[PDB]
Ligand binder design. Structure first.
Ligand code: HEM
Ligand SMILES: Cc1ccc(Cl)cc1
Length: 432
């Protein structure tokens, strides 16, 4: 019944707790082993049930009529992306009483979620992505040509991994190549709201609501950019993903409001590349630690999808979304009360020893690989098949050219409790 101990709670709730993976994963492990379903009561945050167990993540996510993302019929009464209390107060001041700062899928509950998701559901199915595989492969091969030309010593993140997924999504999306640097900068602002090295110059960095102010400022910049793109594609439809979203109409023949397009565009322009970049960089870091795995996958390229799956499980770059209980609910001997918030810890589910043998080991021979890096339930990642295709294609093209990865300097993570992973991985590569 007791609250989670304060230092374990702070490790997971506070963005600074995520600066180093070792203490963070040890806190997730302490909970799974000693307090798998407890309430974190961190000063400055709402109380949060920390959902650390794989089975519990599925139990919550498969019951959206009980555990809402956006607050159910009181739309925007829950923030699906954990802000501190001061930050939610800033957003309620800006929006006028609620937290629905994007019309993107994470903010929506059924049935609205279902209607909006159906705009793009088919586009993102694996069979409908096959038509992009050759373009993706040409993009990978161009990126690998630049890697070979630049020599063996680089930051495998900022000087390699970041560019391929960004170019892929901007090409599919229809954003011109010259706009990639702006999209990259706004993505760093968006996922860096609590990172000391990613602060915007136009917000008060030290204010209690700084992250929320940065989130809002970044969204306003994306809206200004995507307003021009929506109007452009409505006036002159093209055969690109921007057009599918920009021209989408509801069951009465009316365009969805423009902010629904903007919400798709924010999600695709941020999570659509950053997560894949993180997983690719994390894969390279794991091949440096486990050179026998690199040798084995160069020996059998059909192991590449297994390597992608184990990279996704280990890196798990999307750390959480929040839910709110719409009714009291008993789980694992605990009484969740109506109105209580939950934090879904996908990275912790991915280390649950009840599901994975030697869960901290990098083991590509987990078949099936039961990871939950894409979440579960109706909100399960829409982009998962595009991410798996891009990582497969890049590894098919890159690994033949790599004999060895060495980490030659200190890795750096984004300091975030939300969408994290490496921002720097200094390497020495041995090529062929
Ligand atoms: C390695 C790559 C990725 C990982 C690990 C990842 C992970 C996730 C996770 C854990 C969620 C939350 C699921 C839940 O609430 O149960 C999610 C949601 C989402 N992701 Fe992905 N993602 C990746 C790639 C992508 C890509 C490539 C796109 C788009 C092109 C994308 C778009 C989205 C969107 C729109 C949502 C919200 C879905 C909803 O709330 O219904 N993601 N992702
Ligand atoms: C993973 C993720 C999906 C959608 C948004 Cl808006 C942000 C992050």
């Amino acid at each position: 019944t007791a609250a989670i101990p304060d230092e374990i709670a702070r490790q997971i709730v506070l963005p600074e707790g995520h600066k180093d993976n070792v203490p963070l994963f040890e806190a997730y492990r302490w909970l799974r082993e000693n307090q798998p379903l407890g309430q974190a009561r961190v000063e400055g945050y709402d109380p949060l049930w920390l959902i650390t167990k794989y089975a519990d993540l599925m139990e919550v996510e498969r019951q959206p009529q009980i555990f809402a993302a956006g607050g159910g019929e009181d739309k925007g009464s829950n923030n699906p992306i954990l802000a501190n209390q001061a930050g939610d107060e800033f957003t309620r001041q800006l929006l006028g009483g609620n937290l629905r700062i994007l019309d993107a899928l994470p903010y929506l509950d059924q049935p609205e979620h279902s209607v909006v998701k159906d705009v793009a559901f088919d586009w993102f199915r694996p069979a409908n992505l096959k038509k992009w595989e050759d373009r993706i492969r040409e993009t990978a091969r161009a990126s690998i040509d630049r890697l070979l030309a630049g020599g063996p010593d680089l930051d495998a993140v900022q000087e390699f991994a970041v560019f391929f997924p960004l170019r892929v999504i901007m090409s599919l999306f229809g954003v011109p190549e010259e706009d990639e640097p702006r999209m990259m900068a706004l993505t760093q602002d968006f996922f860096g709201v609590a990172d000391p090295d990613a602060q915007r110059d136009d917000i008060e960095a030290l204010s209690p609501d700084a992250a929320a102010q940065q989130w809002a400022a970044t969204i306003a910049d994306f809206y200004a950019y995507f307003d021009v793109l929506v109007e452009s594609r409505r006036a002159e439809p093209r055969d690109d993903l921007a057009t599918l979203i920009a021209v989408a109409k509801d069951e009465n023949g009316e365009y969805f409001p423009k902010t629904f397009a903007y919400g798709w565009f924010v999600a695709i322009a941020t999570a659509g590349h950053d997560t894949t970049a993180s997983t690719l960089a994390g894969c390279l870091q794991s091949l440096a630690a486990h050179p026998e795995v690199l040798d084995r996958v160069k020996g059998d390229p059909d192991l590449i999808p297994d390597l992608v799956n184990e990279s996704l499980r280990i890196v798990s770059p999307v750390k959480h979304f929040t839910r709110v209980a719409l009714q009291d609910y008993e789980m694992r001997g605990q009484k969740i009360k109506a109105g209580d918030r939950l934090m879904l810890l996908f990275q912790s589910g991915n280390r649950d020893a009840e599901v994975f043998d030697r869960p901290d080991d990098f083991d590509i021979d987990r078949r099936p690989n039961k990871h939950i890096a894409f979440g579960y339930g109706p909100h399960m990642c829409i982009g998962q098949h595009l991410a798996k295709l891009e990582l497969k294609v890049m590894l098919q093209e890159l690994l033949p050219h790599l004999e060895r990865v060495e980490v030659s300097g200190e890795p750096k993570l984004i300091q975030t409790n939300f969408v994290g992973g490496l921002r720097k991985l200094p390497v020495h590569l041995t090529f062929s």
